[PDB]
Amino acid sequence: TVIVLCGVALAILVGTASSAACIAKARRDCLTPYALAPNATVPTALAVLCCI
Amino acid sequence: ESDKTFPIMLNGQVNGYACVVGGRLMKPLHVEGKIDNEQLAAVKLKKASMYDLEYGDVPQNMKSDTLQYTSDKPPGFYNWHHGAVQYENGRFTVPRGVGGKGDSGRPILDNRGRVVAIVLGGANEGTRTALSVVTWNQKGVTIKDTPEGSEPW
Amino acid sequence: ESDKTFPIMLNGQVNGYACVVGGRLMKPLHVEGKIDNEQLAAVKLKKASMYDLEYGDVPQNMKSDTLQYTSDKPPGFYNWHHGAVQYENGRFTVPRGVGGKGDSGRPILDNRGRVVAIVLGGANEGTRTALSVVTWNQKGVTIKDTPEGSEPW
Amino acid sequence: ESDKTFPIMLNGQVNGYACVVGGRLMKPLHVEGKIDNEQLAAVKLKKASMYDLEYGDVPQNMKSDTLQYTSDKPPGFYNWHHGAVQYENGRFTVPRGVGGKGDSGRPILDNRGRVVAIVLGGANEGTRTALSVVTWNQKGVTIKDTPEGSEPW
Incomplete structure (x- = not known):
């Protein structure tokens, strides 16, 4: 039992960490070109999605 | 160019030319070294590897004199x-x-x-x-x- | 005045002046910053908070030429x-x-x-x-x- | 002499001199102080205490022009x-x-x-x-x- 519970805990932890890293990298990729340029007329869908 | 283009110093040689534009400093990632200005040395550089650059915010004083x-x-x-x-x-x-x-x-x-x-x-x-x-x-x-x-x- | 009065640095900006009289260096407390003179940076300052000031003993080479x-x-x-x-x-x-x-x-x-x-x-x-x-x-x-x-x- | 002889500074006072000869930098043991040059500061100094000296290998960029x-x-x-x-x-x-x-x-x-x-x-x-x-x-x-x-x- 303890083995399966710790395995499930590790699975959810690595899943959450991977999702967080992926959304952060997507934010980097889709934001850094606009942060280096003036007047970032950004459709706010990406930011509103990935700020939280 | 001469006034507001600060080389990057390292081991007694200039390796690049960091530039301030639109109130933000940029410095290419491929080059390594230290910035001569003491103000620019205290700025946090967010790194964009895909474009081979890192950028940071200039302080309050130096925002007005930028390219x-x-x-x-x-x-x-x-x-x-x-x-x-x-x-x-x-x-x-x-x-x-x-x-x-x-x-x-x-x-x-x-x-x-x-x-x-x-x-x-x-x-x-x-x-x-x-x-x-x-x-x-x-x-x-x-x-x-x-x-x-x-x-x- | 110009020779003996030293600017103070706050993020690279002038924000006050430190004055030397009779072999003691005084500086207002409310003004926060670093003394430009490298030597005076090593001088210990003892503070009169109620008077909004800090005063310290100055070195041997510059106490005579004082205001x-x-x-x-x-x-x-x-x-x-x-x-x-x-x-x-x-x-x-x-x-x-x-x-x-x-x-x-x-x-x-x-x-x-x-x-x-x-x-x-x-x-x-x-x-x-x-x-x-x-x-x-x-x-x-x-x-x-x-x-x-x-x-x- | 003036170009290729670097004073030694300690606490804002000049106390010694280090000299470059034959592509190597020599400094004397009795005097204590830093070297303003980055490269000479980065040089590993091998110390002969009985000779009252320390010699170090000069970098490449200035070995060509030496006394x-x-x-x-x-x-x-x-x-x-x-x-x-x-x-x-x-x-x-x-x-x-x-x-x-x-x-x-x-x-x-x-x-x-x-x-x-x-x-x-x-x-x-x-x-x-x-x-x-x-x-x-x-x-x-x-x-x-x-x-x-x-x-x-």
């Missing part, structure tokens, strides 16, 4: 510390042999004292030298333009 | 880096408009080259501006004279 | 910062009152712009002052010469 961005780039001659650069067919080129290592980060200047591109490297194609640079776009996109065979200075 | 002190204060005009200051009714005043933030710690000099008071702040009455400063007495008592509504510079 | 040395020592006058040292009877002398603390490590130059010896100190014998230095020899040897009652500058 101006641009979007419109008609083909022709453009200013540069080493002379003039030809822009044609969506490509930057210079006479063969001009420039070299340690000149990375040097901004290309417009007639009205406005920055058009930042020098990252140069590829020698025999007759001229094609400049691997980063340019702006009409929709505010920093396109990293690199001709084949580009080598980072 | 000589005095205590006699007849009413009239007295020297100042920005011009002349009027001492009347036991109050130091200036024309309304001159002076402001960053001028704290500015010494007020005499015609013979001696110091009469050190500026800490000012309050605008509309007609003139009364300076909240520290003024000495015949019995060797330093009274921090602050007119009502004083705001430190 | 040349010599071993032939005809007696007579040899130029240096504050005049000419007289060499006679296997000894260096300088008129009374010239030199003092802080001049250690100052090279002695030849008429052809070549270093012959490095000064470590002096000793007062009344009529003149005899220099305790590090002379060289034709057989690939370095000999420190000191008089009676030496005091290292």
